[PDB]
Amino acid sequence: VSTVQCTHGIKPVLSTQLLLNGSLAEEEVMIRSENITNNAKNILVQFNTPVQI
Amino acid sequence: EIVLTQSPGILSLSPGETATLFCKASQGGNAMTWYQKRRGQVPRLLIYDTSRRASGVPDRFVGSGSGTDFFLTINKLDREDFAVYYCQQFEFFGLGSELEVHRTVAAPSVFIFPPSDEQLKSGTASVVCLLNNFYPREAKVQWKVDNALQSGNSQESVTEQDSKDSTYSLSSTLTLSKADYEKHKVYACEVTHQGLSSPVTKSFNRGE
Amino acid sequence: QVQLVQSGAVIKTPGSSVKISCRASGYNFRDYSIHWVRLIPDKGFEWIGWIKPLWGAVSYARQLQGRVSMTRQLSQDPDDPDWGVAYMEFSGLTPADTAEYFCVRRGSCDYCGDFPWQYWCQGTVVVVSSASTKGPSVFPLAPSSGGTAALGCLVKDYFPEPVTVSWNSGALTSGVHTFPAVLQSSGLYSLSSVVTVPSSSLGTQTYICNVNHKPSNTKVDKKVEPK
Amino acid sequence: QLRKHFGNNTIIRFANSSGGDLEVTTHSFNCGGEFFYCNTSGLFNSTWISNSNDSITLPCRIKMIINMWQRIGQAMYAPPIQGVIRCVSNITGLILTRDGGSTNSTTETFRPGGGDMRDNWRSELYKYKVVKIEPLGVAPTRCKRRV
Ligand SMILES: *[C@@H]1O[C@H](CO)[C@@H](O[C@@H]2O[C@H](CO)[C@@H](O[C@@H]3O[C@H](CO)[C@@H](O)[C@H](O[C@H]4O[C@H](CO)[C@@H](O)[C@H](O)[C@@H]4O)[C@@H]3O)[C@H](O)[C@H]2NC(C)=O)[C@H](O)[C@H]1NC(C)=O
Ligand SMILES: *[C@@H]1O[C@H](CO)[C@@H](O[C@@H]2O[C@H](CO)[C@@H](O)[C@H](O)[C@H]2NC(C)=O)[C@H](O)[C@H]1NC(C)=O
Ligand SMILES: *[C@@H]1O[C@H](CO)[C@@H](O[C@@H]2O[C@H](CO)[C@@H](O)[C@H](O)[C@H]2NC(C)=O)[C@H](O)[C@H]1NC(C)=O
Ligand SMILES: *[C@@H]1O[C@H](CO)[C@@H](O[C@@H]2O[C@H](CO)[C@@H](O)[C@H](O)[C@H]2NC(C)=O)[C@H](O)[C@H]1NC(C)=O
Ligand SMILES: *[C@@H]1O[C@H](CO)[C@@H](O)[C@H](O)[C@H]1NC(C)=O
Ligand SMILES: *[C@@H]1O[C@H](CO)[C@@H](O)[C@H](O)[C@H]1NC(C)=O
Ligand SMILES: *[C@@H]1O[C@H](CO)[C@@H](O)[C@H](O)[C@H]1NC(C)=O
Numbered sequence: 185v186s187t188v189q190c191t192h193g194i195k196p197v198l199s200t201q202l203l204l205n206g207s208l209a210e211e212e213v214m215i216r217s218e219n220i221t222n223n224a225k226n227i228l229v230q231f232n233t234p235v236q237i
Numbered sequence: 238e239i240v241l242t243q244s245p246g247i248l249s250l251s252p253g254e255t256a257t258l259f260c261k262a263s264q265g266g267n268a269m270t271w272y273q274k275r276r277g278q279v280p281r282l283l284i285y286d287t288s289r290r291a292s293g294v295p296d297r298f299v300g301s302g303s304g305t306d307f308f309l310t311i312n313k314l315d316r317e318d319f320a321v322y323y324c325q326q327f328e329f330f331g332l333g334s335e336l337e338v339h340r341t342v343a344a345p346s347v348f349i350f351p352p353s354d355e356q357l358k359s360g361t362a363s364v365v366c367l368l369n370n371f372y373p374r375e376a377k378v379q380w381k382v383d384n385a386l387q388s389g390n391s392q393e394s395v396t397e398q399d400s401k402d403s404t405y406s407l408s409s410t411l412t413l414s415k416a417d418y419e420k421h422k423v424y425a426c427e428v429t430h431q432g433l434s435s436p437v438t439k440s441f442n443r444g445e
Numbered sequence: 446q447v448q449l450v451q452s453g454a455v456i457k458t459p460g461s462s463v464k465i466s467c468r469a470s471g472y473n474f475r476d477y478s479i480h481w482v483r484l485i486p487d488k489g490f491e492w493i494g495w496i497k498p499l500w501g502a503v504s505y506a507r508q509l510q511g512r513v514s515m516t517r518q519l520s521q522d523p524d525d526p527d528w529g530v531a532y533m534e535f536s537g538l539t540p541a542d543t544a545e546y547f548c549v550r551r552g553s554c555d556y557c558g559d560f561p562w563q564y565w566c567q568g569t570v571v572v573v574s575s576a577s578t579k580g581p582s583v584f585p586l587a588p589s590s591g592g593t594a595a596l597g598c599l600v601k602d603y604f605p606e607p608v609t610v611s612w613n614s615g616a617l618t619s620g621v622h623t624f625p626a627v628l629q630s631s632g633l634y635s636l637s638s639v640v641t642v643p644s645s646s647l648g649t650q651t652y653i654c655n656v657n658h659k660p661s662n663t664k665v666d667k668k669v670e671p672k
Numbered sequence: 673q674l675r676k677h678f679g680n681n682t683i684i685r686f687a688n689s690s691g692g693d694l695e696v697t698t699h700s701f702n703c704g705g706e707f708f709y710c711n712t713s714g715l716f717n718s719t720w721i722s723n724s725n726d727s728i729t730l731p732c733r734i735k736m737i738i739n740m741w742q743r744i745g746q747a748m749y750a751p752p753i754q755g756v757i758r759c760v761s762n763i764t765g766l767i768l769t770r771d772g773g774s775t776n777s778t779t780e781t782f783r784p785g786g787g788d789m790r791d792n793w794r795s796e797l798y799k800y801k802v803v804k805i806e807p808l809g810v811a812p813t814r815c816k817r818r819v
Contacts, residue, residue: 191797191800194796194797197702197792198700198702198740198789198792199699199700199701199702199792200695200696200698200699200700200767200786200787201696201698201699201700201712201766201767201784201785201786202699202712202763202765202766202767202784203763203764203765203766203767203792203795204701204761204762204763204764205761205762205764206762206764206765206795206796207764207796208764212673213673215673215674215677216795216798219558220677221266221327222327222558222559222560223327223328223495223504223769223770223771223772224478224495224504224559224560225769226767226768226769226785226788226791227766227767227768227769227770227782227785228765228766228767228791228794228795229765229766229767229768230764230765230795231763231764231765234762234763234764235762235763235764236760236761236762236763237760237761237762237763238774238775238776268558270560270561272562279565279566279567279568280565281565282552282561282562282563285557285561286556286557286558286561289557291552291561291563292552292563323489323490325490325560327558327560327772328492328506328560328772328773328774329774330489330490330491331489332489333489346592346593348594348595350586350595353584353585355584355585356584356599356601363584363599363601365586365599365637367595367639369595369622369639369641392627392628392630394624394625394627394637396622396624396625406622406624408624408637408639410627412630475742491774492773492774497787499742499787500692500693500695500696500742500786500787501691501692501693501696502691502692502696502785502786502787503690503691503692504690504769504771504783505690505771505773506771506773506774507771507772507773507775507777507781508773508774508775509773514691516691519742520744521744521745522744523744523745526744
């Protein structure tokens with residue numbers, strides 16, 4: 185843990201189904217959800233390498 | 238896929254006592270939710286996140302459980318707290334747990350209703366065995382056509398436990414074609430209970 | 446109060462498709478998910494699907510793919526936001542789809558999940574049967590002549606349900622038993638209804654079984670006596 | 673790394689959508705001053721069975737009367753941009769959702785999900801927490817005010 189004065193600069197982009205110009209992972213792909221066996225919960229996926237469009 | 242199991246199927250238990258119902262999860266999870274269905278009355282939420290109460294649920298329903306085994310308990314079992322209960326995890330359900338009224342044993346007064354000409358003029362007649370005013374609900378009611386066992390031609394229905402006598406009835410039928418009833422003579426049923434020390438039959442010989 | 450009014454009772458033939466509506470009120474309709482569940486008479490509950498308003502995003506079961514579809518109707522009034530109407534279309538009906546459908550909302554919460562179901566609609570029964578509307582006949586039941594004995598009638602081969610049967614029009618109510626409708630004999634129901642009377646009064650009185658099949662306007666009256 | 677949450681020997685499949693408005697069946701942008709709604713049924717379509725330059729084209733619609741957050745009786749309008757529009761972007765992440773009915777099959781299916789903006793922000797501010805600083809404290813010692 186490290187104390188920070190101000191967070192890094194997030195770029196507000198309003199999109200659906202895909203996260204554009206986001207922040208990457210560090211080593212591997214990070215799959216991330218709340219109650220994984222629950223259907224109504226969305227599953228957040230985060231890449232370590234950007235996929236261009 | 239988680240599969241939920243419940244036991245006992247029917248809990249026969251007297252008012253004023255405790256009643257403890259059981260549901261068994263198959264995967265070590267987190268929580269469970271219970272519903273109450275009062276004989277056709279739009280099922281209501283009872284226990285919530287394994288131990289919290291919903292809105293309007295009285296204090297006589299105490300939730301409990303952990304791991305793969307989860308409990309329900311009604312501390313002072315009333316007359317209106319007889320129902321059928323269900324347990325739910327995310328989208329998977331149990332099969333049910335029925336609460337009934339306990340009573341001492343009794344004996345049904347056996348009948349045999351003869352095949353009338355009123356239905357045999359249409360081509361299919363009804364030989365109607367008919368039991369009334371008994372408990373327990375389970376019974377092994379067999380029948381015979383010319384002293385020979387038949388099958389596949391019967392539709393038997395039970396009834397529900399009454400609010401005044403707390404007893405049961407039963408009515409079976411034996412629907413055959415018009416060639417088949419006049420072919421035979423000796424028509425009889427068979428009745429067999431925990432509360433009878435002897436098999437009881439009654440008869441109606443056709444034409445006699 | 447959180448109301449959920451579901452309509453309505455439907456009888457259809459196999460191969461058809463039904464649309465069932467579910468009107469909600471008393472809360473902001475654009476905020477809360479709406480589950481759809483089905484209650485089989487001999488298999489228990491079964492979760493059909495799940496609709497989220499404000500955009501209409503849906504998900505279904507995986508055994509009900511290719512058949513179900515559901516949408517909503519958002520109230521557009523700047524001075525009345527608290528109502529809304531949901532829908533559900535359940536196509537590809539077969540007779541094994543006959544059950545009672547519900548439209549279930551959760552409650553307000555801090556520490557729980559989505560599936561705990563607090564507010565319940567009244568439900569509606571969707572019958573799928575190839576039988577057509579037919580009246581009941583009536584057939585007497587009695588002994589030939591101390592101990593109590595069963596008078597009664599037989600109300601055989603009708604469609605659809607329910608038959609309301611009264612006795613001597615209609616004050617003879619004690620000792621009266623009814624059975625639930627005997628299942629489909631080629632698509633048609635029957636009802637047994639017997640009344641226990643001491644065997645002295647069999648040879649005295651004339652007894653009447655008053656069948657009232659209301660959806661076909663059929664009415665019959667058989668006299669019951671020891672033949 | 674889905675298979676570490678479900679099982680090694682499972683089959684993982686991707687489907688495309690099951691209904692809704694244009695805001696949740698498709699991929700929304702905000703680039704260059706216009707509002708694109710692209711059809712992504714060509715990306716989320718494959719199976720997985722546990723063992724150069726050709727680009728995938730995505731057709732795309734345009735509309736200029738949008739209603740964001742679906743407030744009653746309110747709508748916006750984007751003025752047209754003079755000239756053709758060009759954009760370059762990276763895709764860093766997805767929002768899937770799982771179907772899950774009660775059957776016995778070994779085949780999971782994952783679909784992209786849409787309309788709630790709190791998944792765009794909760795996927796970025798996840799490593800933070802705000803704390804309060806309480807300066808006073810008490811501790812026993814051998815000090816004695818000296819009367
Ligand atoms: C994801 O991030 C990328 C990387 O930044 C981002 O791409 C950027 O898009 C903006 C869109 O505004 C680009 O800015 C334009 O760039 C062109 C390049 O020639 C300029 O001509 C533009 O100048 C005009 O700007 C206004 C438009 O009307 C006018 O008022 C003005 O007078 C000029 O005519 C403008 O600078 C930007 O260059 C790119 N970045 C890079 C590195 O190319 C992308 O938009 C992000 N994704 C999303 C969905 O937003
Ligand atoms: C992808 O989604 C589209 C619609 O979002 C589906 O398209 C339908 O496909 C069926 C064929 O099975 C057609 O009869 C329908 O007319 C199509 N819908 C529309 C709106 O045109 C499609 O099935 C999905 N899956 C794949 C693999 O393409
Ligand atoms: C999104 O794109 C898919 C194809 O990439 C569309 O599917 C087509 O639907 C039309 C409508 O009948 C068919 O004629 C085509 O044959 C379909 N294509 C394929 C490959 O099956 C889909 O309809 C598009 N989405 C919407 C909403 O129109
Ligand atoms: C979109 O992705 C590209 C690819 O990472 C980013 O461009 C740079 O690419 C080089 C590859 O030679 C990397 O070493 C750099 O770290 C990348 N970033 C920078 C700032 O140079 C591009 O920056 C990405 N877009 C955004 C908005 O970050
Ligand atoms: C999801 O997991 C969290 C972890 O703390 C738990 O508190 C919660 O009860 C779980 N939700 C459900 C619906 O089981
Ligand atoms: C699945 O694969 C992982 C890969 O290391 C292994 O650790 C794990 O034991 C496997 N599980 C089963 C049930 O085979
Ligand atoms: C979906 O997958 C099938 C099978 O691989 C493929 O033939 C079809 O082209 C795909 N759909 C689109 C829109 O690319």
